[PDB]
């Protein structure tokens, strides 16, 4: 631990992502291994690049320190170990769905999917944020509904 000019930077990045972000999920790395975070590394890298950062910050004065500003409901998501996956450009694209599918491979746990603060709820694994660019499914029935 350094003094105060070192912890505040962790909180600075945390508050920057918490406020300037989007849908995010939770990954309770009670016993993190080498390939768990690696698979999540590829998972987040597909998100446009390096903006889906996930560090092992579960402290009340680290990750809960940036709760007062934005995401003011992480006090209940601040106990034992909660790796907040704050997002960045875009939307909820697949972080929730990908996390559910990765957490279902016995990768450590996620505190029963505690959840971040997008909606007006707490814990609800929704699949209504996958498709957000598709614009070619409305051009498949035009050359089959003309003869008849």
């Amino acid at each position: 631990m350094a003094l105060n000019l070192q912890d505040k930077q962790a909180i600075v990045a945390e508050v920057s992502e918490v406020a300037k972000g989007a849908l995010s999920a939770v990954v309770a790395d009670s016993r993190g291994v080498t390939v768990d975070k690696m698979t999540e590394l590829r998972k987040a890298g597909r998100e446009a690049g390096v903006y889906m950062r996930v560090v092992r910050n579960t402290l009340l004065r680290r990750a809960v320190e940036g709760t007062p500003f934005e995401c003011l409901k992480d006090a209940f998501v601040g106990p034992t170990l909660i790796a907040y996956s704050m997002e960045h450009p875009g939307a909820a694209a697949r972080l929730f769905k990908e996390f559910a599918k990765a957490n279902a491979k016995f990768e450590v746990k996620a505190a029963a999917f505690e959840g971040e603060l997008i909606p007006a709820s707490q814990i609800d694994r929704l699949a209504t944020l996958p498709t957000y660019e598709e614009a070619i499914a409305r051009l498949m029935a035009t050359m089959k509904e003309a003869s008849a």
């Binding site: 690696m38 590394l41 987040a44 690049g49 390096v50």
Partner: peptide, 8 residues
């Protein structure tokens, strides 16, 4: 490579 950026 873990570096999520290509230049990283």
């Amino acid at each position: 490579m873990t570096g999520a950026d290509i230049e990283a």
